[PDB]
Subunit: 124 residues, 3 copies
Amino acid sequence: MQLRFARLSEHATAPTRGSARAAGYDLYSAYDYTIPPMEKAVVKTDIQIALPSGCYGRVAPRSGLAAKHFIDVGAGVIDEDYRGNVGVVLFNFGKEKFEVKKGDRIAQLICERIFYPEIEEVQF
Amino acid sequence: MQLRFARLSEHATAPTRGSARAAGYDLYSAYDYTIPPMEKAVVKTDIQIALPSGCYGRVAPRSGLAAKHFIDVGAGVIDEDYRGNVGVVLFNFGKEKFEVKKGDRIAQLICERIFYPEIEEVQALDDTERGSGGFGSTGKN
Amino acid sequence: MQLRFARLSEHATAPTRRAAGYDLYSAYDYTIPPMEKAVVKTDIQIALPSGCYGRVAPRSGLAAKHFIDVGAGVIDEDYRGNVGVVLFNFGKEKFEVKKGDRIAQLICERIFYPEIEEVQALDDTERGSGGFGSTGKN
Ligand SMILES: O=c1ccn([C@H]2C[C@H](O)[C@@H](COP(=O)(O)NP(=O)(O)OP(=O)(O)O)O2)c(=O)[nH]1
Ligand SMILES: O=c1ccn([C@H]2C[C@H](O)[C@@H](COP(=O)(O)NP(=O)(O)OP(=O)(O)O)O2)c(=O)[nH]1
Ligand SMILES: O=c1ccn([C@H]2C[C@H](O)[C@@H](COP(=O)(O)NP(=O)(O)OP(=O)(O)O)O2)c(=O)[nH]1
Ligand SMILES: [Cl-]
Ligand SMILES: [Mg+2]
Ligand SMILES: [Mg+2]
Ligand SMILES: [Mg+2]
Ligand SMILES: [Mg+2]
């Protein structure tokens, strides 16, 4: 169905797909970050999103950033009921120092289909 | 539509959803753990789970822990057929020693719906729009 | 229903499995130093079935014993190139991957392909902006 979103500021960019059948919607940064080596930043999208029923939005890493700059994505479980600013938890591993500019595609968002089951205790 | 669990000891805590439409059931540590900086640990829940069909259980990181304490979850693929202790592999990437107390919610379990496809070898695959495109080919901006 | 693959070289091994993942086999030998990464080639190309992507996921044995993790991991339905496994070596030791070692697994994650629609404001929820620990520690 529909991935509804709203901007929270002029700095936000609409999620965009890299190709017709890309799994993820790229998420852009709303600000500049300087993230030191072996550090973490919570990067802001300045968007709230409303995920379709029966899924959640998984923040996943891009492969170019992972493979080329040693960037990972922490956290990344966006719940169907979350109406706040979507944050991307980025990990800068390895040497150097990762530089994020406003408008940078730093992750991607996937509508992972899940169950919400009732839980029931019974008796590598 | 039903996630079955059994307690493996008296130190287990029934998993619980943080909100009405939370993607994950939070998993509780069964023991005290001290994870040094740049180190890992398999945290025991002391529960066994029977996931419902057509899904597996992904052990996923919580965002407070990752944002505030630089904690990640490694591994994470609980198979539908697994009946042992559900273990949470925590990575402490922070400079801090991280203290896990018995009863702390240190991860969440998501029932990811999946296919169980048959694998078939073909001689060559056909081209598409993406093609061999990948690893930052579409760019940064 | 069906996962099609073709070998891109004689060094590829057919993935193998109610396991959620088909284990992916390295095509070559790699040495990954401490606190470093590598793109390990499988030398296979895949055609995932519709309505799913292929997530490259870590195996728990290599994670628990050797501090191995998988970065990236989003194989799109329309990708036709060499499936590459981005291995992260967070351990203090160098990690030796030999050709034929199962270094990852591939999961066919069912997903939606929704249309993106900008609205002025969204419906509200109980959760609301709560996130990043707002439900507490225990
Ligand atoms: O990468 C993320 C992960 C989570 N979040 C927000 C959205 C999500 O709905 C909310 C809760 O995420 P988790 O349940 O994964 N984290 P945690 O359990 O720490 O937060 P809470 O106690 O509120 O449930 O935090 C982000 O903005 N970015
Ligand atoms: O985070 C995890 C990951 C796996 N496990 C357990 C449950 C799972 O069904 C079992 C197998 O997981 P993987 O296949 O992902 N790892 P590996 O391939 O190393 O183990 P095995 O060879 O037995 O399949 O390990 C956990 O308890 N926690
Ligand atoms: O772990 C991975 C991730 C991606 N890939 C390939 C397949 C995927 O379809 C393609 C692009 O994947 P991502 O979109 O996740 N990475 P990125 O967005 O940087 O590449 P691109 O800009 O081309 O989309 O790269 C791998 O082989 N292994
Ligand atoms: Cl949402
Ligand atoms: Mg992409
Ligand atoms: Mg939560
Ligand atoms: Mg396995
Ligand atoms: Mg990861």
